[PDB]
Amino acid sequence: STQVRGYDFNRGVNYRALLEAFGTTGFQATNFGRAVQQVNAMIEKKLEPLSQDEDQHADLTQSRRPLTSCTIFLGYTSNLISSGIRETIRYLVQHNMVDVLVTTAGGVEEDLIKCLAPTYLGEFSLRGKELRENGINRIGNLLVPNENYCKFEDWLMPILDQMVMEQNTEGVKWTPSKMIARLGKEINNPESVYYWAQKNHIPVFSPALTDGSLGDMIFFHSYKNPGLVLDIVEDLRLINTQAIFAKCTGMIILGGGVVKHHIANANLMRNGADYAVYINTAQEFDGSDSGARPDEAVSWGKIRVDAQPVKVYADASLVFPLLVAETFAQKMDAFM
Amino acid sequence: EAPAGALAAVLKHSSTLPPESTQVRGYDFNRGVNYRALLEAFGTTGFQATNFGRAVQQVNAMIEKKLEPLSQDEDQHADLTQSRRPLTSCTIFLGYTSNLISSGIRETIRYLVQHNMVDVLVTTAGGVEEDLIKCLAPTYLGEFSLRGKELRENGINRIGNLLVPNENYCKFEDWLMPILDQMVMEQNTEGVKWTPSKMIARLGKEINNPESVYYWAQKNHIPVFSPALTDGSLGDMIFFHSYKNPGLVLDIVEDLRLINTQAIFAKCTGMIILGGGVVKHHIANANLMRNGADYAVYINTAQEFDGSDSGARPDEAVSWGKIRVDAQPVKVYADASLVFPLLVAETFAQKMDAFM
Amino acid sequence: STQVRGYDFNRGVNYRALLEAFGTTGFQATNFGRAVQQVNAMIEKKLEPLSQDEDQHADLTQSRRPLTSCTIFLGYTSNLISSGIRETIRYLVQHNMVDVLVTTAGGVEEDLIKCLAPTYLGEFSLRGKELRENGINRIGNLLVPNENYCKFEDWLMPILDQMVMEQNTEGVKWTPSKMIARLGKEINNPESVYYWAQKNHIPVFSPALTDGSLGDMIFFHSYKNPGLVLDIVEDLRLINTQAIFAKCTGMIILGGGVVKHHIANANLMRNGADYAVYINTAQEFDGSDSGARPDEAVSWGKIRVDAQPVKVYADASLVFPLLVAETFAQKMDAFM
Amino acid sequence: EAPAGALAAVLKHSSTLPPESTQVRGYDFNRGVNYRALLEAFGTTGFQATNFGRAVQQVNAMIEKKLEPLSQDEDQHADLTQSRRPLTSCTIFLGYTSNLISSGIRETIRYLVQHNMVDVLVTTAGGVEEDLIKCLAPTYLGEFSLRGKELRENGINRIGNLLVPNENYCKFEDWLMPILDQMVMEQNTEGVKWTPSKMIARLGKEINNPESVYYWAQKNHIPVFSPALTDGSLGDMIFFHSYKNPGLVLDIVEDLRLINTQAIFAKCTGMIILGGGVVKHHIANANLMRNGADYAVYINTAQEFDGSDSGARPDEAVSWGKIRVDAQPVKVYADASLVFPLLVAETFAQKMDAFM
């Protein structure tokens, strides 16, 4: 039995000790401590060597990425890529610390656009009428000028031309994940999440990739250069095979919606993830999958019965950099 | 001896409010129980009850607009939208998350589609498949607190305080596999280019059951968009089927052209959005293509403070051009299982005469 | 096992059938149906006669109110008295349908002030600076002109003069509940909750009665007429004795904070309430009592282990009139 | 051939933002782990991380103001406030709900009071008694999902994901009853007029333990207001004791005069409010008596949509005059068990040199 006790600032500001004290502080601070333990378990598993038997089974995929003892799925909503958590995610992907990414369309395009033009701080209360009259789009307390999307249009249209030509003359069958790899290669910029994902052979799934600015541009482009196809069925096979042939899996899911369900549903194909951490502000009472507790996923087989999953009820812009500081960033040497 | 500055601060003088101003007053049960009068009193009760009253007014404005006559060239509209659905004076987009189709709101939505009262549906994969599965086997009441280990050991899946046996999905598999066979055959020998909306139309025709939302949608030529249709049991089944009968392709690009042209060539549009996520964003982004919806009602429990699109207020969408600056959109902060049947009772269900 | 099925509007708009269908609709609609059942159980118990043995024990209080088989505690936060739920609560109190009220200071004073001047509809987004410059106070999407409080001052100060004189020359020992009864008698208006509460011998507890406009006025008054005492200890005995000597109790609690805890803590003195319905929007994850599920109260003994308590996660301005329509209002004849 | 109106709506031109404008950028872990730099980066990360950065700036402004020297007449101030506490250039009110004293935030708050860094405390009954009980017996970690029946059968009470055995309250009873005896004797023969704040000062002196918040508050002459002090275990004990030793009176009127004069005669005030309910409203209402607080930080998880004071944004308090129109208040939407230790680390704990 562990007693409740908070950090005593009479010791001074010892930041590592202060973070470690969240575990015995209670409420969501304790869940944060549990999340640190869960992610550290994923990492310690990932760094354990594969045995001959495990290596054989795990090599049964047609994937370029070297195999590890724990395949980590990282999911995040679009708002987090507009936020500075974009830098946190880029770091993990840059250093091969996660294996599969799932995000929404905005979570793809806003990373690429930040390589062309920045996002700014604003306020939640700013009025839409005056913002619209000035061509400024609001995302929470952030602001994106519409010229950001003008710049995106100029950058993206020549790539769309090439994708259609490769489709029609070289037999390419595009899917969202293949498009995202190509866009990351094109952006060719070390500040971009998707640049590092394609460089490190980390696939990115986004089955509703048309639901944003990328879609806007594909739509306009289709009138002068018709026929681009994005198949979502092949990408479903690809993500499910990453779960089925994993030795162990971990899920780290920031936010709700499709990013959460799609990762969890892939792990149901292996009868459940071994480790799971959720960070989101959704509540269960309306029955939404977004707000469901991890124990709902256990009933489905999306999380194993013997797992000890954790949800932290918090804005990930506060908690996720602290989690990374106490986990992945402490083992950076092992990932290089 | 009371401090003067304190007295000045607490007992500051006021301005008279506009003569327009509406007083707060709740329903008086000394009148007895007239449920119509009770619901009408929500408008002057305050907080989310007042937002409910505003939502009734917004949806009734959508319906009244939709019922105004219009002259328009049938042929050009159909060519520009590649849709057989005739244009009306207000194109209503109805979006809803998967949980609401597991709930009894499935019946509410089915009623609206059955009577051709909305024009476009957007939902997630679960919002498609659980409507079809309910024609094969029921969903049951349970509790939120039921433990996953015991449920999993008994082959029962939890959805909030609802429960679905694994066997429901076995029945779904048996029903769906022959249809997937036909879809692959039609793709490869009859040139069919499948998209989510075209698949959902076919599944509604195949289920052939008037309790199904999607049966009525296809019969009434109401398209259903679901750009991540692979994210659920339908995806599971497409995946398993592809190892027995490879080659099915579902394109999301053509479905993007179809939904966006529904907004672009509308006379007016309204959005009724239950929940958040892709269903909310996809409807609103289509309406950005016409510089914004004319009417909008959101019902959801999401909060803005984490910056999520799901939790954003309607006024965020105004900044983007997804809602017109001149619109008067409404968000009701509530579980739609409570509020949507009441909203329908006071709006669409009152205008049933006009829809026949 | 009960199947999920929603109301079918092909039947037309049969409002009673539509409300009854919430029970099988799921999520919070099902919890609403459960709340209707719980409140109807309280009412059916309340109307059951007392046996000789029960009557003896239950008559052991020094309270004027006739005894019933179920003592119902109704708690509500201040915002609800600013809302039109004030009318709903007034109806229940007018017809002796509940037995004990608990509210905060604002929940007392705003009922009295509405007899002097109305509250108006506004918007949540109205800016505080422009409102303050015009002397308009915001409560959610409601608006109260500051002159409302001017009018309250003129009404209340002569009563405060009399209370101090009765304290100092007639031995009166004031408590919050005794003050609230006196204010209800003074307002002398059938639209007032507290008018009906004192007329029907329904006590009102509010241990932090100084936390609002009443407090403002007592404070200013104390400089010209010092010495008024409001004892909270006697009121603690009074509320606890209502629970201890009840045959059965029910709790109907709208909102959180002191109104919720004070009713629940009184019922712990009898080893728990027999029936309980919570309606509020608070969430459990921060550990707050306001957001705790009913099952937390079971661990304390505030709700009996054999009870079937219900929480509806919703704004009570939507749900509480519907609940009353399906419960108390259907048995109005029995309460007259 | 892309529709022109669509192109015009989606690709609308923009205005240049002020040169002031701050770009979004998160902490770069390629730098390694410098926790101070990591916390500083919250300001430019967005959403509630940005609000945390703003809260750091607001509390540091309170502290910097408090440390400015001031000449003022000791005697008149003391007569007008009936307080021995010397005036500083910024009077800081710290409010917190009961759950936070059951949590480890008890240690955080105790540190601030121990070093005289705040001037007024407001909490609920639980926020008083659980600090005292922790000097007798500990609180334990548990889980939110633990079932009440099994816990009750084992004599364990749940507070969120924390657990307190019944025996803690038995130890509290044994400790408290002799003190209540002395309080009744002092009331009846020495003219003491008890109020919650005076009782809380006495209990802190009696617990005589440097782990206790209230031990330090009374030693440093920091008053604690709790107008519903009877609403908890202290109330239970006062109730039981009154049948053995009748007559204790706790007056809330004099405590209202004491807290309001703390605000009225302040040079400046700041509010730091953790949670909602009475603690939030009581601090803010006291500050209305001076026409508003100069600085304010709220940390809570409550939402505005139900109209509750707990969930109200700071800008609602501006309409009332509880916060000055010229102030720049901040709300962080978060569990304070996560954010308050980080806030203290970046504010009060950095200025420890000045407070000694």
A235 is in an annotated binding site: no
- Rounded to whole angstroms, the Cα distance separating A154 from C168 reads 84
Instruction: Collapse the DSSP code of B157 into the 3-class scheme (helix H, G, I; strand E, B; otherwise coil) and give the result.
Output: strand
Nearest-CA distance from A133 to chain C in Å? 20
Dihedral, CA atoms, B17, B22, B25, B30, nearest 10 degrees?
130
Q: Write the CATH number of the domain with boundaries D21-356.
A: 3.40.910.10
Residue B276 to residue A286, Cβ atoms within 8 A: no
Residue numbers in the known binding site of B for spermidine are 129-130, 236, 281, 307-309, 316-322
Q: Are B102 and C4 in contact (CB under 8 A)?
A: yes
Q: Are D62 and D271 in contact (CB under 8 A)?
A: no
- In chain A, whose CA is at the least distance from the CA of C125? A125
- In chain A, whose CA is at the least distance from the CA of C287? A27
Look up residue B236 and give its two tokens: 């599971």
Nearest-CA distance from A157 to chain B in Å? 15
- Strands across the sheet with D224-225, in order? D224-225, D120-123, D91-96, D269-274, D295-300, D330-333
Sequence spans of domains, chain A: 1-336
Look up residue A304 and give its two tokens: 């194993």
Residue B264 to residue D5, Cβ atoms within 8 A: yes
Look up residue D313 and give its two tokens: 């944004």
Superfamily of domain C1-336: Deoxyhypusine synthase (3.40.910.10)
**Residue appearing with tokens 């936060």:** C77
- Rounded to whole angstroms, the Cα distance separating B346 from B57 reads 9
Look up residue B243 and give its two tokens: 């190892």
User: Which residues of A are marked as active site?
Assistant: 302
Interface of D with A in 1-30 (CB under 8 A): 1-2, 6-7, 10-17, 21-30
Q: Are D165 and D171 in contact (CB under 8 A)?
A: no
- Rounded to whole angstroms, the Cα distance separating A107 from A206 reads 9
A289 is in an annotated binding site: yes
Q: How far apart are the first and last CA of chain B?
A: 74
Residue count of chain A: 336
Helix spans in chain A (H): 15-20, 27-46, 52-58, 78-82, 85-94, 105-113, 128-133, 147-170, 176-187, 193-199, 213-224, 233-244, 258-268, 294-300, 316-326
Catalytic residue at B322?
Answer: yes
Instruction: Collapse the DSSP code of D251 into the 3-class scheme (helix H, G, I; strand E, B; otherwise coil) and give the result.
Output: strand
Task: Supply the angle between the helices C213-224 and C105-113 in degrees, to the nearest 10.
Answer: 90
**Residue appearing with tokens 């698949």:** B199
The secondary structure element, H or E, covering residue D64 is helix D47-66
Look up residue A240 and give its two tokens: 């499910």
Residue count of chain B: 356
Q: Which of D156, D236, D315 sits opposite C299 (nearest CB)?
A: D156
Q: For residue A82, give the nearest of B316, C33, D199 by alpha carbon.
A: B316
Residue of D7, D51, D52, D305 for testing the chain B interface, max B β-carbons within 10 Å:
D305
Instruction: Collapse the DSSP code of D257 into the 3-class scheme (helix H, G, I; strand E, B; otherwise coil) and give the result.
Output: helix
- Rounded to whole angstroms, the Cα distance separating A290 from B97 reads 10
- In chain A, whose CA is at the least distance from the CA of D143? A27
The secondary structure element, H or E, covering residue C278 is strand C275-280
Residue B278 to residue A104, Cβ atoms within 8 A: yes
Q: Which of C46, C114, C260, C302 is catalytic?
A: C302
Q: Are A321 and A287 in contact (CB under 8 A)?
A: no
Q: Are C214 and C156 in contact (CB under 8 A)?
A: yes
Radius of gyration of chain B (CA): 23
Residue C257 to residue D278, Cβ atoms within 8 A: yes
Chain A residues within 8 A of D137 when measuring between CB atoms: none
Q: Are A263 and A256 in contact (CB under 8 A)?
A: no
Within an 8 Å CB–CB cutoff, is residue D148 touching chain C? yes
Residue of D107, D111, D163, D319 for testing the chain A interface, max A β-carbons within 10 Å:
D107
Look up residue D39 and give its two tokens: 């916390």
Largest CA distance in chain D: 96
Q: Within a 10 A sphere around the Cβ of C336, how many other Cβ atoms?
A: 6
List of chains touching C (3+ CB pairs within 8 A) = A, B, D
The values of phi and psi at residue D162, to 5°, are -110, 165
Within an 8 Å CB–CB cutoff, is residue B192 touching chain A? no
DSSP letter at D137 equals: S
Radius of gyration of chain A (CA): 21
Buried-state track C84-118, b at ≥16 Cβ within 10 A, e below 16: bbbbbbbbbbbbbbbbbbbbbbbbbbbbbbbbbbb
Q: Within a 10 A sphere around the Cβ of B89, how many other Cβ atoms?
A: 15
Classify burial at B333, counting beta carbons within 10 Å of its beta carbon; exposed 0-12, middle 13-18, buried 19 or more.
buried
Q: How far is CA B23 from CA B26, C84, C124, C144, in A?
A: 10, 10, 16, 10
Q: Are B139 and C24 in contact (CB under 8 A)?
A: no
Look up residue B324 and give its two tokens: 């017109």
Within an 8 Å CB–CB cutoff, is residue C335 touching chain A? no
Q: For residue B14, give the nearest of C117, C213, D327 by alpha carbon.
A: C117
Residues contacting residue C62 through CB under 8 Å, at least 6 positions apart: none
Q: Which of C27, C125, C287 sits opposite A286 (nearest CB)?
A: C27
Classify burial at B353, counting beta carbons within 10 Å of its beta carbon; exposed 0-12, middle 13-18, buried 19 or more.
exposed
Q: Which of A269, A286, A295 sits opposite B148 (nearest CB)?
A: A295
Q: How far is CA D203 from CA C28, C230, C233, D214, D257, in A?
A: 44, 21, 17, 7, 21
Residue C122's identity, in one-letter code, is G
The values of phi and psi at residue A219, to 5°, are -60, -55
Residue B47 to residue C16, Cβ atoms within 8 A: no
Q: Within a 10 A sphere around the Cβ of B164, how many other Cβ atoms?
A: 25
Residue D306 to residue B47, Cβ atoms within 8 A: yes
Chain A residues within 8 A of B316 when measuring between CB atoms: 128, 138-140
- In chain B, whose CA is at the least distance from the CA of C330? B33
- In chain A, whose CA is at the least distance from the CA of D14? A135
Nearest-CA distance from C211 to chain A in Å? 29
Residue A10 to residue D114, Cβ atoms within 8 A: yes
Q: For residue C79, give the nearest of B48, A8, D241, B317 by alpha carbon.
A: B48
Dump the DSSP string for C26-50.
-HHHHHHHHHHHHHHHHHHHHTSPP
Residue D338 to residue A318, Cβ atoms within 8 A: yes
Q: Which of A83, A222, A317 sits opposite B257 (nearest CB)?
A: A222
Residue count of chain D: 356
Residue B125's identity, in one-letter code, is A
The secondary structure element, H or E, covering residue C74 is strand C71-76
**β-bridge pairing C120-121 and C142-145:** antiparallel
Within an 8 Å CB–CB cutoff, is residue A63 touching chain D? no
Residue A130's identity, in one-letter code, is E
Q: Are D105 and D289 in contact (CB under 8 A)?
A: no
Instruction: Collapse the DSSP code of D158 into the 3-class scheme (helix H, G, I; strand E, B; otherwise coil) and give the result.
Output: strand
Q: How far is CA D228 from CA A77, A198, C208, C209, in A?
A: 43, 61, 5, 8
Within an 8 Å CB–CB cutoff, is residue B173 touching chain A? no
Buried-state track A26-60, b at ≥16 Cβ within 10 A, e below 16: bbbbbbbbbbbbbbbbbbebbeeebeeebeeebee
